[PDB]
Amino acid sequence: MDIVMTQTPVSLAVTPGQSASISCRSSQSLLHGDGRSYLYWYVQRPGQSPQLLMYEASTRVSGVPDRFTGSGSGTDFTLKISRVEAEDVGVYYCMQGTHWPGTFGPGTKVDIKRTVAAPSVFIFPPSDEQLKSGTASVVCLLNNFYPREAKVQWKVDNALQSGNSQESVTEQDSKDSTYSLSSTLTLSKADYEKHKVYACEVTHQGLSSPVTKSFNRG
């Protein structure tokens, strides 16, 4: 009947050394016949493979520091990190393996808190060498911003473009705790020459109004 997995809080910004505490709830009980609650924690990180931290609700994966502690049974489980470091930064997920099929929560963003930083926006036309290949990749860059939440909107001749776009954000910088992001609009050479002005529109909490960076192709 597919157990619904809920997670709270939605987001968590923390001071290096301060403790964190993530909770996870299941729509039905995950207690198994052998007395074990089959629910495991893992953290997602950009450009990395997911790291398993806790399993069987309370048992710690070998190699994970003692800062991590698993708690709960039945329908309520909590993960606690006593001294959050920069390497602990990521989006934390709980997943139940008791009932088929497996199900996981929405996740909780955990990163180091810093002051709000508005992104520096730069747009780049495709190279003449790549257009010689028949492909055009327009790139919009968002540099050193916090928090992660940001929206990139591509516009072609002031018309909204949504297709043929890829987004890629870095990990939280271990030093200044900012993020950097790149969005690439990849078009055919023929489609690329059907428009005059290319622009990306960026929305971020630190900006009063959306910032648009444009260019015109020759």
CB of 118 to K ion, least distance (A): 6
One-letter amino acid of 72 = G
Site string for K ion, 118-137 (x = CB under 5 A): --x-----------------
What is the rounded distance in angstroms from the CA atom of residue 139 to the CA atom of residue 198? 10
Which residue, 136 or 204, has its beta carbon nearer to K ion? Answer: 204
Which residue, 79 or 141, has its beta carbon nearer to K ion? Answer: 141
By the 8 A CB rule, do 110 and 162 touch? Answer: no
Which residue, 69 or 144, has its beta carbon nearer to K ion? Answer: 144
One-letter amino acid of 4 = V
Segment contacting K ion by CB under 5 A, of 128-136, 142-150, 161-169, 192-200: 142-150
CB of 185 to K ion, least distance (A): 22
103, 144, 186, 203: which one contacts K ion (CB under 5 A)? 144
186: contact with K ion by CB under 5 A: no
CB of 138 to K ion, least distance (A): 21
> Residues interacting with Cl ion, by CB under 5 A?
38, 40, 55
Instruction: Return the structure tokens found at 135.
Output: 């492909």
Residue 120 contact among Cl ion, K ion, none, beta carbon within 5 to 8 Å by kind: K ion
Segment contacting K ion by CB under 5 A, of 31-39, 41-49, 141-149, 167-175: 141-149
Binding-site ranges for K ion (CB under 5 A): 120, 144
